[PDB]
Amino acid sequence: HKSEVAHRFKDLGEENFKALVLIAFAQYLQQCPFEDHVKLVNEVTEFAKTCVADESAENCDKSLHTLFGDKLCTVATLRETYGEMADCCAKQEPERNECFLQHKDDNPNLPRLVRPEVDVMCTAFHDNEETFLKKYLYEIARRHPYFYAPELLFFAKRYKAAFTECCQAADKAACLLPKLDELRDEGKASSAKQRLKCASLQKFGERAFKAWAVARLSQRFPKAEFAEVSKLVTDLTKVHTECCHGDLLECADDRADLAKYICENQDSISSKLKECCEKPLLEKSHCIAEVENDEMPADLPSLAADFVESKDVCKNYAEAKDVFLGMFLYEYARRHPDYSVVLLLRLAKTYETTLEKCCAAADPHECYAKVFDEFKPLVEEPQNLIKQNCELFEQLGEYKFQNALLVRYTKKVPQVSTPTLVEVSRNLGKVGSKCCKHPEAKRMPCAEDYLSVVLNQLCVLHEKTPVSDRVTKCCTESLVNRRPCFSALEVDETYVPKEFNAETFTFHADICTLSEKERQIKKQTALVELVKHKPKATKEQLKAVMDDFAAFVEKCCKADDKETCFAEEGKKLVAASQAAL
Numbered sequence: 001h002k003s004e005v006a007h008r009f010k011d012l013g014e015e016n017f018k019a020l021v022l023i024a025f026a027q028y029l030q031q032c033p034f035e036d037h038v039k040l041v042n043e044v045t046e047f048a049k050t051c052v053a054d055e056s057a058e059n060c061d062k063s064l065h066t067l068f069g070d071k072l073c074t075v076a077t078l079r080e081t082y083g084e085m086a087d088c089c090a091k092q093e094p095e096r097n098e099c100f101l102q103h104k105d106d107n108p109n110l111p112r113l114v115r116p117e118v119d120v121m122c123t124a125f126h127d128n129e130e131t132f133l134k135k136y137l138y139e140i141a142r143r144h145p146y147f148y149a150p151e152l153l154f155f156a157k158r159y160k161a162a163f164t165e166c167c168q169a170a171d172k173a174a175c176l177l178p179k180l181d182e183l184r185d186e187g188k189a190s191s192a193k194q195r196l197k198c199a200s201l202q203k204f205g206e207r208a209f210k211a212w213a214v215a216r217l218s219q220r221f222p223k224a225e226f227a228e229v230s231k232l233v234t235d236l237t238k239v240h241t242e243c244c245h246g247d248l249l250e251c252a253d254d255r256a257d258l259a260k261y262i263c264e265n266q267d268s269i270s271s272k273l274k275e276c277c278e279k280p281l282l283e284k285s286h287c288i289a290e291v292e293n294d295e296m297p298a299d300l301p302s303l304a305a306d307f308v309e310s311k312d313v314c315k316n317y318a319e320a321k322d323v324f325l326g327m328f329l330y331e332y333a334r335r336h337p338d339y340s341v342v343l344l345l346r347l348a349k350t351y352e353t354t355l356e357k358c359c360a361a362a363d364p365h366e367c368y369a370k371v372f373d374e375f376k377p378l379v380e381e382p383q384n385l386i387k388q389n390c391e392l393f394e395q396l397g398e399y400k401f402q403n404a405l406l407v408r409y410t411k412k413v414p415q416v417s418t419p420t421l422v423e424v425s426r427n428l429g430k431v432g433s434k435c436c437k438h439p440e441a442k443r444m445p446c447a448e449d450y451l452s453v454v455l456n457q458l459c460v461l462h463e464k465t466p467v468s469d470r471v472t473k474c475c476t477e478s479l480v481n482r483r484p485c486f487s488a489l490e491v492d493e494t495y496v497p498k499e500f501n502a503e504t505f506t507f508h509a510d511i512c513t514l515s516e517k518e519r520q521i522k523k524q525t526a527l528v529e530l531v532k533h534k535p536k537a538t539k540e541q542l543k544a545v546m547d548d549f550a551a552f553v554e555k556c557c558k559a560d561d562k563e564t565c566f567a568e569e570g571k572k573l574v575a576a577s578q579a580a581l
């Protein structure tokens with residue numbers, strides 16, 4: 001490999017290459033117009049071809065970091081448009097590249113993307129497919145500078161597949177919309193997860209990150225040996241550190257490597273890793289990351305043998321603490337792919353604590369004897385929450401369920417902004433739909449997965465505009481205590497009911513013309529405000545007031561002269577209701 005560009009060009013292929021250079025340039029020069037990046041992609045692509053034909057052609061020998069930075073520094077508007085960023089072209093490549101990552105605005109001042117009408121999109125998609133998907137890839141890229149490019153390209157192809165299909169259908173809207181909403185959520189879900197892992201790494205450091213990775217990789221690869229798992233974690237830890245820093249190339253190569261490794265040692269790691277290892281370069285790592293858990297060996301011993309009933313536990317521990325605990329996790333995780341990762345960590349931390357007490361006691365073995373017994377309540381806590389909640393969800397569907405949460409949390413944290421409470425309660429309700437569909441054994445992992453994102457978003461918002469110390473407590477706790485902390489919140493008996501507002505409970509006939517989406521939002525907002533004005537209201541009281549309301553809306557959105565039924569009958573409701581409470 002004399003020419004780095006020629007090599008990448010050959011591994012990737014024209015199409016992928018061009019999409020990637022586009023994304024790459026958009027993530028740095030987020031303020032330049034589309035036509036400008038397009039010209040650049042062609043210049044870079046014409047260059048890459050020159051090197052595919054002769055690796056001795058000028059500059060073909062230069063490294064990607066150099067080629068990229070040099071190209072970047074040719075833009076004449078640079079100085080005027082990015083200013084300080086232009087000062088980076090005064091440094092030598094080593095730091096020049098570093099200077100660029102520093103001026104990568106994570107959340108720029110660009111308008112939110114508006115989804116056009118299905119027909120507008122389908123037609124544009126037909127008249128000129130390429131510039132249609134590239135214009136958007138550009139739009140998305142400039143807005144999410146740290147999103148892993150290949151991951152982005154992966155999303156694009158699913159978008160292209162949704163149009164090719166749906167845009168030929170009799171009723172396009174009915175086909176496309178549902179697909180455009182699935183992707184949106186996955187993209188947003190995927191992004192939040194990346195930002196979250198990097199935050200976690202930064203905040204709690206490498207040790208906690210590796211512990212987390214040990215548990216997750218063990219549940220996934222129960223067959224692999226601890227020596228293999230440690231090796232994987234180290235590599236995985238070095239990978240995220242590098243991808244979190246923001247350097248795309250570095251990140252790409254580290255992942256590529258790790259993916260090649262895992263494949264070569266496939267038999268030694270996991271069985272369900274075949275296909276993944278067959279896919280093209282760009283997809284290998286993405287596939288592996290989402291690989292399904294392998295089956296755990298049927299011939300596995302009792303943990304209590306090597307971690308409790310054995311003597312010399314303290315010796316093996318003292319010799320290499322983290323290694324020993326690392327082992328306990330590995331042994332406890334691959335036997336429990338049904339536990340959440342933080343639950344496994346919660347146990348490990350408990351084992352750690354007792355070993356740190358017991359090993360310094362008279363008779364250690366007899367001290368850490370009934371330690372497994374201390375795990376029990378830690379395991380049941382989350383299991384009961386799942387049974388308890390999904391049972392409720394099975395009764396009243398998603399919407400009514402979202403309502404029960406609405407009443408539950410508004411009573412626990414009144415000070416929170418009504419629109420904020422509606423937002424989270426709704427998302428939480430979705431997690432219920434998504435995870436309660438699974439068999440008992442996958443529910444916890446599923447909920448841990450969705451809750452982590454929602455809980456994080458919640459804390460960020462509260463960080464910016466604080467409202468409750470409790471929420472700040474829970475939010476600044478260890479990532480292992482975060483959720484149990486929020487589950488420990490109790491009804492706020494300090495709160496003083498807000499002043500009744502007639503306006504707040506006045507509804508017009510427009511709610512009849514609104515979409516189920518709006519109706520719900522409108523109603524749920526009134527529901528929250530109801531709890532804020534009379535938080536001491538029983539679930540019985542609320543239920544009755546809610547039913548009446550149901551009728552109300554119905555019996556008004558089906559009557560002659562709608563606008564009067566909502567003014568006469570409503571005043572009645574608001575009076576009848578006020579009295580009941």
Ligand SMILES: CCCCCCCCCCCCCC(=O)O
Pocket residue numbers: 204207208210211214322323325326345346348349352478479480
């Ligand atoms: C390979 C490293 C394994 C280390 C095992 C330590 C397990 C303790 C739980 C990890 C969380 C540490 C942060 C905390 O105290 O909450």
Ligand SMILES: CCCCCCCCCCCCCC(=O)O
Pocket residue numbers: 505523524526527530545546547549550573574577578
């Ligand atoms: C003083 C109280 C004024 C009465 C206003 C009641 C508003 C409650 C909203 C109930 C909406 C529940 C939605 C539903 O029935 O599906």
Ligand SMILES: O=C(O)c1cc(I)cc(I)c1O
Pocket residue numbers: 217236254255256258259285288289
């Ligand atoms: O999720 C990842 O980023 C990831 C990437 C590679 I490459 C291998 C494994 I296992 C992973 O979990």
